[PDB]
RNA sequence: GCUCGCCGGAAGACCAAGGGUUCCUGUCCAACGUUAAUCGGGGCAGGGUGAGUCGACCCCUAAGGCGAGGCCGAAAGGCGUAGUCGAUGGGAAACAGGUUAAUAUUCCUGUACUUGGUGUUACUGCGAAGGGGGGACGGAGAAGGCUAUGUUGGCCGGGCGACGGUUGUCCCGGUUUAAGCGUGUAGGCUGGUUUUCCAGGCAAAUCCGGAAAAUCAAGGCUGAGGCGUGAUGACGAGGCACUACGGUGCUGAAGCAACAAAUGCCCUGCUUCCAGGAAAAGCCUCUAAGCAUCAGGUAACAUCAAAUCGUACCCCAAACCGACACGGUGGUCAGGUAGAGAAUACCAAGGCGCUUGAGAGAACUCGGGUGAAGGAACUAGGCAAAAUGGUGCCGUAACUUCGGGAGAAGGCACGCUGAUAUGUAGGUGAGGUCCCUCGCGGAUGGAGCUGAAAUCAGUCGAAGAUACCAGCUGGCUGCAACUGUUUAUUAAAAACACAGCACUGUGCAAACACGAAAGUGGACGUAUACGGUGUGACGCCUCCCGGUGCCGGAAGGUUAAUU
RNA sequence: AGGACCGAACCGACUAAUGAAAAAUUAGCGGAUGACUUGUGGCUGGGGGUGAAAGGCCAAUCAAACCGGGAGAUAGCU
């Protein structure tokens, strides 16, 4: 059965990657939030 | 034209292994560890100057570092650049 | 000619083809071509703005000349061509100075026919001259509404317009709709009817044919649930409401012209 | 190690994606492995991924994204021009053999190619953000020419049979060879060459386009395959020396022909249809500003250059997505016998026996086999089973929209051997002989090879479409015309859609829709069009305006802000 | 020629019996040149999308997704 997650690196990066997050305001805020929390992996970026 | 200092900083070490020994004995090819940033021409220049020996050609590759586990803690070894340097016929290296 | 296809399969039974042999069997004039990608009836917001559009065959865009400005040079018709972009047929013409253009193929036009634009041009089919030069009572097509803009009225397969009157700076046209409309007398127009008049006689004959023409199927509002359409819901078949659009506006009669800027030019509305 | 069994259009081989060391070697067996474990995709250590020509990067663009100015917007921001990104598409170049425990079109051996510089001598119009050409394009169908590949014969090597026979019309194996360079064929497309002029190609153009005029019928482009060379080479069945039983070193015959033949190539071709079928660069070409006897261009020759990143391994799976060593997952390769076949059966190459076993042979459950007599009596219901099942030929009703119905129904033949005919009809096609504008040519010729289908005669069986495979059929009737779609995971239908019909709106800055707007779709469309609503092939058809809607009217009544 | 026929791949999911499986199995079943199917990338966003329309689908979630916040909502109820 085709399960929901069907990985694709490029698609992952474009969707969720660092630059994408940077591009828009809301993404930047998300980034800031994650920094505040102390996340080790700020983004999906490997 | 490569700067001498850069040349000196290129070459990290000789690589000892069965495959390396075979390459040395048969194909007249030395296997070096080199700076990850070191390009082929650079490596060649450094070989020529620092070991005083003619180079035919350099093949390079990047060795990825192994993931290991010290006790409970996971940790990755460094990646590093390997260079097969083929030396001109009759070139004997110390 | 129209051709009723033999019923060797359902979906072929009711088919009627409109076959013109005189069209060009060949690749169109490539210089006048250009790309034309499909919308899916979706705008820049990415939302569907006009339902029932989608798919269909890849089509190129022939660059038709509706402005028709090569005044004084006589042109000769090379061939008639299939345009996927319109109900009419197009004609590749060759001007004496070496330029080629696509034009709407009028009714009587065929290969070898000579045509001409300009004030001096002759009053014969396919020729184009300002409507102050065109005699009253003539049929014209590809009519400009604004001078210099390009023909906008009467471009569809078998349309034409009647010049009923010329009163000073304006002339009054009888549009195919039956609407009587004033238009500046200096605007341009092409003599005769537009060509492919038996276009209407074709019948698709199956669902797939509609799809080929980029038309997605239509769901009736009454078949929906109330949350979707004003007509939705009802156990069994219920329709106890006045007909309306998906957006609640009355459909069977309610007028929707709101343009007060051009009211003056409409002599008489259609009926 | 020897037997047995399974897959073999896969359960084999190679990739992409995704994973990220799982690869190889040594070592260990606590945990992990549904048992044991000396084994492991487990632990620990070490090793392993070599590129000018493969891919990325790079040049070019699609959908789309971002977007200087700009337009719009309380703010945030939205749209969008110039631009710039964006492959899943376009754009230069490599093949064969050998080698590692583990990489290889990357190492080695041989033989190649590419496109840049730089320098040269030789020549002499070069030059783009611009013009033109090209790239550049659909579906289906039909062949013909080919090859991949396979079969047989020939040849070469080996063999003479654990049991009757087996020196022959016997048995086993092998019989392979690239890119490149030369040749330019089967075939496809197109008339060429020169001269003159011209409101066209945002300017110019010697280019394209268009007009004339002259002259010759061959000119050019394209093109699989074959042939030659590449190759006195490599590889080569197996023989022979050493042996850490893993292998290593030497050596090495023949290496031809015919037939058959793709879904691969010629073919981005041809024929045809309507639903009318990317873009841009690379590439060719034309000039402009320019420069002017310099640069630049093309000409060979020399030299330098090709960086960087990926390259292990899995990849229909125990390594990816599924919590698991648990169904899903795109591409490429496609042997033999039978067969229409990529179905099916048995096999090859190759890969596996699915990580608990041993007994026993109760009930009951699951999955199968057979069954006296009956044959739907079962049951809500013939559910399920059973049955039918192929090719050829004969034959086939109502009704019909004249196409259908129809494989209607129902029947007959079917194996093997011999003869017709030591293998026919056909297909292919060598020598020889003749012609020739000479070649991959044309005629004639028929050797050899291959080879159905039929008829007649015989013959065995209970049975010859013998296994696997492979329609059940007919009669009346509701609904829906039909092919389609649908509740992912209890509903596939009479529901939706449909072609068709009707009403209605909409004159283009269209109606309408998304948008505080700008704008965008509608549509680069224009009433033979587009939108909305209902109905729903086809046939015969299809009173009430009082109510509520809509349309038109505006005499009077009433009536806001305002005053 | 064909939204033509029989039929593998491929797409589906009518009947049947039966956790390896949070929808599968085997045996049969429908389509199989098209209103087909499929890879890669792109766009549409929550009273919003998309919808051959079933209130279907929008990450095992849908008559209004998920995450965080108002928030210790309110609970004459248990």
Coordinates of C-alpha atoms (C1' of nucleotides) in Angstrom, one line a residue, chain D residues 8 13 106 110 133 174 178 197 218-219 224 229 328 334 344 405 428 445:
Chain D
rG8 C1' 13.5 -18.2 -14.7
rA13 C1' 21.0 -9.0 -14.4
rU106 C1' 37.2 5.8 -14.0
rG110 C1' 45.5 -1.7 -27.1
rG133 C1' 17.6 29.4 -41.2
rG174 C1' 33.6 -24.3 -28.7
rA178 C1' 34.1 -3.2 -30.2
rC197 C1' 15.2 43.9 -59.6
rA218 C1' 21.4 15.9 -62.2
rG219 C1' 22.2 18.8 -57.8
rA224 C1' 19.9 1.8 -41.1
rU229 C1' 40.1 -1.8 -42.1
rG328 C1' 3.9 -0.5 -2.2
rA334 C1' 14.2 -10.3 -22.6
rU344 C1' 1.0 -21.0 -19.9
rG405 C1' -27.8 -9.4 -32.8
rU428 C1' 15.2 -17.3 -49.4
rG445 C1' 20.0 -18.7 -63.3

